[PDB]
Design a protein around this ligand. Structure first.
Ligand SMILES: [Br-]
Length: 48
């Protein structure tokens, strides 16, 4: 159930609303395990 999980990651982690909209556009347009890991990787980094 990765898309729900990563949508919640974005909500929790990304406070800047433009970054949030871009990640959600990114997430909506990806579906493979490779693409999802790369989005997750950038969400994790963005909170450092
Ligand atoms: Br956007």
């Amino acid at each position: 159930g990765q898309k729900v999980m990563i949508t919640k990651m974005i909500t929790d982690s990304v406070a800047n609303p433009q970054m949030k909209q871009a990640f959600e556009q990114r997430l909506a347009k990806a579906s493979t395990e490779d693409a999802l890991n790369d989005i997750k990787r950038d969400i994790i980094r963005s909170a450092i």
